[PDB]
């Protein structure tokens, strides 16, 4: 895991307000994307969703994410540069109202 790749991934995380690292065949990723973009209607134009299994540098990005967030699995969600976690973490925030609050500056 090179520092160059790590720096690049931090760049990607900050490009859009909502960042999601996922894999196309993962049900946890599907639930997270559904929650954010279908149920909550977060504008897709304010999000960068990486499907690592369809990225030539997917494994390198995932390794960089582990270094940056300590997380080893997908989905890996960031909102406004802050690490949110995975699908279960998203569900907890959704239920206690904190997800709606942190997405306030994003919704439009």
From Swiss-Prot:
Domain of life: Eukaryota
Residues modified to Phosphoserine: 2, 56
Domain spans labelled Glutaredoxin: 6-108
Keyword tags: Cytoplasm, Disulfide bond, Electron transport, Glutathionylation, Mitochondrion, Oxidoreductase, Phosphoprotein, Redox-active center, Transferase, Transit peptide, Transport
Reported effect, residue 29 to S: Leads to 30 percent decreased oxidoreductase activity
UniProt keyword Isomerase, yes or no: no
Keyword Membrane: no
UniProt: glutathione binding residues: 23-28, 74, 87-88
Positions where S-glutathionyl cysteine occurs in the chain: 26
EC number(s) per entry: 1.11.1.9, 2.5.1.18
Disulphide bridges, residue numbers: 26-29
Induction description: In response to exposure to reactive oxygen species (ROS) and upon entry into stationary phase.
GO cellular component: cytoplasm; cytosol; mitochondrion; nucleus
One term of GO molecular function: glutathione peroxidase activity
Family from the record: Belongs to the glutaredoxin family.
Something else known: Present with 31400 molecules/cell in log phase SD medium. It is unclear whether the long polypeptide observed in mitochondria represents the immature form of the protein before cleavage of the transit peptide and release of the short form into the cytoplasm or whether two mature isoforms exists.
Function: Component of the glutathione system which performs several activities such as glutathione-dependent oxidoreductase, glutathione peroxidase and glutathione S-transferase (GST) activity. The disulfide bond functions as an electron carrier in the glutathione-dependent synthesis of deoxyribonucleotides by the enzyme ribonucleotide reductase. In addition, it is also involved in reducing cytosolic protein- and non-protein-disulfides in a coupled system with glutathione reductase.
Protein's name in the database: Glutaredoxin-2
Organism: Saccharomyces cerevisiae (strain ATCC 204508 / S288c)
Lineage: Eukaryota, Fungi, Dikarya, Ascomycota, Saccharomycotina
């Amino acid at each position: 895991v090179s520092q160059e790749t790590v720096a690049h991934v931090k760049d990607l995380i900050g490009q859009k307000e909502v960042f999601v690292a996922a894999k196309t065949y993962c049900p946890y990723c599907k639930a997270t994307l559904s929650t954010l973009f279908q149920e909550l209607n977060v504008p897709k134009s304010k999000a960068l969703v990486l499907e690592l299994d369809e990225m030539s540098n997917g494994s390198e990005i995932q390794d960089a994410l582990e270094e940056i967030s300590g997380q080893k699995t997908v989905p890996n969600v960031y909102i406004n540069g802050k690490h949110i976690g995975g699908n279960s973490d998203l569900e907890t925030l959704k239920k206690n109202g904190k997800l709606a609050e942190i997405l306030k500056p994003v919704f439009q």
